[PDB]
Amino acid sequence: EIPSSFDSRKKWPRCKSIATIRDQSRCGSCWAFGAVEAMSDRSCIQSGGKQNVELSAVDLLSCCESCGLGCEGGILGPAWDYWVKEGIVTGSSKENHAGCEPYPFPKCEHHTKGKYPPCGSKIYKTPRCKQTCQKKYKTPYTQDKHRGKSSYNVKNDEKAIQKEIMKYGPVEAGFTVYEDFLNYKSGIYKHITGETLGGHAIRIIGWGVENKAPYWLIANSWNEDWGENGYFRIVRGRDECSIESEVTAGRIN
Numbered sequence: 001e002i003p004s005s006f007d008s009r010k011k012w013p014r015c016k017s018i019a020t021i022r023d024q025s026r027c028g029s030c031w032a033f034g035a036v037e038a039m040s041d042r043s044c045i046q047s048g049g050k051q052n053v054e055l056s057a058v059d060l061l062s063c064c065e066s067c068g069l070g071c072e073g074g075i076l077g078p079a080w081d082y083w084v085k086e087g088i089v090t091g092s093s094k095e096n097h098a099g100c101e102p103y104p105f106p107k108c109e110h111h112t113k114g115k116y117p118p119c120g121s122k123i124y125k126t127p128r129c130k131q132t133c134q135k136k137y138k139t140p141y142t143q144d145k146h147r148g149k150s151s152y153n154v155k156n157d158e159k160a161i162q163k164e165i166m167k168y169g170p171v172e173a174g175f176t177v178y179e180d181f182l183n184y185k186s187g188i189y190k191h192i193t194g195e196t197l198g199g200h201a202i203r204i205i206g207w208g209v210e211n212k213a214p215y216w217l218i219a220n221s222w223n224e225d226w227g228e229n230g231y232f233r234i235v236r237g238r239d240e241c242s243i244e245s246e247v248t249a250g251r252i253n
């Protein structure tokens with residue numbers, strides 16, 4: 001039976017990644033962020049907390065040849081296939097500089113007010129695939145790789161998505177991003193105004209209902225100043241902006 005609400009941060013609080021919001025910076029790497037966040041969560045959840053890792057967004061973004069155009073956007077299935085086949089090393093944000101390959105780009109404000117420099121309009125070029133851990137990290141790159149066993153698309157059915165998240169952990173999901181999404185501050189989003197800006201990829205961590213209105217609870221990769229402390233909610237059950245139609249995940253065992 002599916003509960004009225006679910007929050008992965010509450011089910012698996014030993015796994016620090018689940019409540020961590022990241023910042024993709026001035027790069028169209030949402031595809032890689034939703035992937036390594038949900039892979040970090042699932043590596044911990046599915047290993048009973050043995051793997052406590054923050055997986056490197058830059059390793060996936062820079063080294064997966066089949067995942068698309070890097071800082072110009074990517075593709076979800078091949079990202080999870082790369083995790084299964086090649087694996088991904090560890091790496092934190094630029095500012096924290098922990099792990100094998102921390103992210104090279106700084107935090108910035110994405111279409112919203114706050115204390116970080118504005119992201120502005122320029123996009124960085126995709127970083128090179130360097131295959132080298134930072135000097136202080138004393139595991140060689142190939143030996144820091146964490147690999148999945150399987151990956152898959154989740155059925156485009158609300159209950160199937162809920163069951164998947166509650167049993168196996170947060171999922172990555174794509175949706176169509178329209179101009180009014182870049183004005184989101186709080187609440188339950190639905191597309192009302194603006195034209196399409198293409199696809200966006202995020203991490204669904206749970207669901208809930210407020211004033212009879214059902215929603216998905218989602219982490220964006222635009223830092224903690226955007227939205228509801230980095231999260232947003234979106235209508236659930238009506239394939240709003242195709243949110244139930246592009247769900248991808250995988251398992252380590």
Ligand SMILES: *[C@@H](C(=O)N[C@H](C(=O)N1CCC[C@H]1C(=O)O)[C@@H](C)CC)[C@H](O)C(=O)NCCC
Nearest residue numbers: 027028029030031073074110174197199200201
């Ligand atoms: C998703 C992605 O990264 N989208 C972009 C984005 O979020 N950016 C680009 C610059 C910084 C950040 C921003 O706008 O603040 C942008 C196109 C959203 C409007 C990426 O394009 C992707 O991989 N999409 C396909 C997912 C299946």
